[PDB]
């Protein structure tokens, strides 16, 4: 036993490495960025028929132009999601403009290494966040997808998977993605890929899907809109 | 410093809190202390550990503490820890009285102390208090009451109980003799002596070795008294006369 801010001989923070491993215990989520908008899709991972599926929320609205998909230790994600929400509203308040997807992601990622047990306030963070996040949205740069992990590293991706089957899903993504792909194509592709990787049979209640498009605000797919897409797949 | 921190406020692998358990072992070795609820009152009876010949006898008891007008307690475990907690009980009871201008209801005082005990098991890195308490009282909501708390910050109400040395045996004898809804202070007193007589099996029971307090109501006022040695010997006498009847 050693402190939470101890480096390994390889130059990595043990706690951060260990937090990255917790992401592998999450359900799979996928993001794809097209010139017509971004989609976010996530495996719900229902553990009992008695559980209400709509109470699993692994895709959330950050603001009208920005959604977020999470995988890993979901309870940890709450303060991150709330920070993103507060930050975009502060930016609107101060600057009367929407905050960029990149900027939001940056703000949240600045929390990542703020843990430790003798710099900080009487009960500050004791450990990093066991969560990875995909921020998908539209700003003046156009549609955009960004990934962030517990190291606070963040980067734009054209398509990305996270969670348990991300290897796998990321391969199928390299295979199907192309820069001129339509949003409808990307939606089909991410449901086809979820369908491969999911232990359970895919259906309209054990996945979620959302989009954001230059036209149109953050939109969570209804049961009925999922059922329509699921027919081809 | 992480090397020296014995980590008093963490879970063990089975979801246990070792300090709390260990503190409970300290209590089980302390002086036996019982509480018995009756229709007309409530009592505490405790084994004295302050029994050497050269001791001086200066307070009105060893382990019975007045908390406010309507309540008292006894304790089993680390004495100095008990002094901290009983001081805190008195403070809580005056805070209430200041604020509401009525006596703190019994269960509310117990729960307030128990929340302090609980905190000590959850944060702050300190050893818990090594004290279990029995609380006797009257309030206008539930009348005569008896409560028990332990170092986990857990508590419960009882019609009769025991903490400290030979607790398990004492509770068995209570289970068997206690008449729910039909006890008087006089018969609770007899029973208390019967129980201590069995559970102080090191050795032959004597007034110098026990302390008894009663809590009754007289003319709309709570009366809390520690029995004098004359009365304690009389009850011991009566119990010894009673066991002479036991066969024929």
């Amino acid at each position: 036993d050693r402190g939470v801010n101890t480096f390994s001989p390889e130059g990595r923070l043990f706690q951060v490495e260990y937090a990255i491993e917790a992401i592998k215990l999450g359900s799979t989520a996928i993001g794809i960025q097209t010139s017509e908008g971004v989609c976010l899709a996530v495996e719900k991972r229902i553990t009992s028929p008695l559980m209400e599926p709509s109470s699993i929320e692994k895709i959330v609205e950050i603001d009208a132009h920005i959604g977020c998909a999470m995988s890993g230790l979901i309870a940890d994600a709450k303060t991150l999601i709330d920070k993103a929400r507060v930050e975009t509203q502060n930016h609107w308040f101060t600057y009367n403009e929407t905050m960029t997807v990149e900027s939001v992601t940056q703000a949240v990622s600045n929390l990542a290494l703020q843990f430790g047990e003798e710099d900080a306030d009487p009960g500050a963070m004791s450990r990093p966040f066991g969560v990875a996040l995909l921020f998908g949205g539209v700003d003046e740069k156009g549609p955009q997808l960004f990934h962030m992990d517990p190291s606070g590293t963040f980067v734009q991706c054209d398509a990305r998977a996270i969670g348990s089957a991300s290897e796998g899903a990321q391969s199928s993504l390299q295979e199907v993605y192309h820069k001129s792909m339509t949003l409808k194509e990307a939606i089909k592709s991410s449901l086809i890929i979820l369908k491969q990787v999911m232990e359970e049979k895919l259906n309209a209640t054990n996945i979620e899907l959302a989009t954001v498009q230059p036209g149109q605000n953050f939109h969570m797919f209804t049961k009925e809109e999922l059922e329509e897409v699921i027919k081809d797949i | 410093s992480r090397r020296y921190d014995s980590r008093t406020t963490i879970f063990s692998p089975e979801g246990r809190l070792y300090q709390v358990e260990y503190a409970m072992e300290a209590i089980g070795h302390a002086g036996t202390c019982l509480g018995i609820l009756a229709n007309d009152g409530v009592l505490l009876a405790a084994e004295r550990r302050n029994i050497h010949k050269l001791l001086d006898e200066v307070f009105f008891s060893e382990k019975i503490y007045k908390l406010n007008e309507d309540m008292a307690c006894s304790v089993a475990g680390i004495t100095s820890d008990a002094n901290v907690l009983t001081n805190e009980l008195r403070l809580i009871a005056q805070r209430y009285l200041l604020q509401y201008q009525e006596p703190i209801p019994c269960e509310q005082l117990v729960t307030a102390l128990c929340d302090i005990k609980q905190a000590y098991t959850q944060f702050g890195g300190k050893r818990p208090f090594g004290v279990s308490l029995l609380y006797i009282g009257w309030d206008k909501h539930y009348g005569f009451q008896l409560y028990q708390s332990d170092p986990s910050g857990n508590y419960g109400g009882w019609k009769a109980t025991c903490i400290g040395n030979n607790s398990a045996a004492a509770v068995s004898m209570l289970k068997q003799d206690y008449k729910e809804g039909e006890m008087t202070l006089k018969s609770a007193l007899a029973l208390a002596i019967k129980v201590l007589n069995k559970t102080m099996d090191v050795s032959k029971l004597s007034a110098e070795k026990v302390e008894i307090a009663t809590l009754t109501r007289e003319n709309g006022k709570t009366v809390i008294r520690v029995l004098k040695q004359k009365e304690v010997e009389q009850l011991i006498k009566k119990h010894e006369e009673e066991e002479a009847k036991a066969e024929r």
Binding site: - | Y4, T8, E25, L55, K126
Partner: protein, 230 residues
Amino acid sequence: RGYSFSLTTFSPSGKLVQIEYALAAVAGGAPSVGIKAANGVVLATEKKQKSILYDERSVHKVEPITKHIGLVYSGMGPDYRVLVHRARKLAQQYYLVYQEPIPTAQLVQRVASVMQEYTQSGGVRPFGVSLLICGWNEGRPYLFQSDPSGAYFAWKATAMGKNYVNGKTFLEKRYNEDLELEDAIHTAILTLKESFEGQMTEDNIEVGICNEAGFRRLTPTEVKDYLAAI
């Protein structure tokens, strides 16, 4: 900063071993005795006084807290000085509020409470001393012991430090309720002679007394006088 965790904790068997171990430092300390007579209290202690080079008068083990209360100890001297200082401060705090000297028992309770803190509070060990505290108030003598746990006890007579078990049985077979203070001083000094080693002089024991007139150390010359008989 300060360590914020307790250094005293429960062992599996329910023991606070740091407090036991503090009691072992007390037991290895120099002997102290207190006897409560009918009309007063005597405190007496052996000086662990090596060398003729020591100026015996330069530090005292028997100390005044107030005009009417005094203390002695067995165990670690420097720990005792802490408690003497706090006891004095406690007594004055009481006097400022109530305008009456602190009753002996109240003083013992507040000092004992400090000792309890050092068994739980963060980054500290318990005090390695036991105190004998004498006083006179409500027209009557008091003798108390306060131990490293913060437990206290009222005694008619007792002994602490090296060879205390024997000292206690020596006093059992010697104290009576109706004993006078001057006789009590004699029996206190005899109790020290039971475990002395070295030949007693007025310079290697220290004696304090407490009665209606107040608490004071006996002077070397007064001790010399009691020593002629012994």
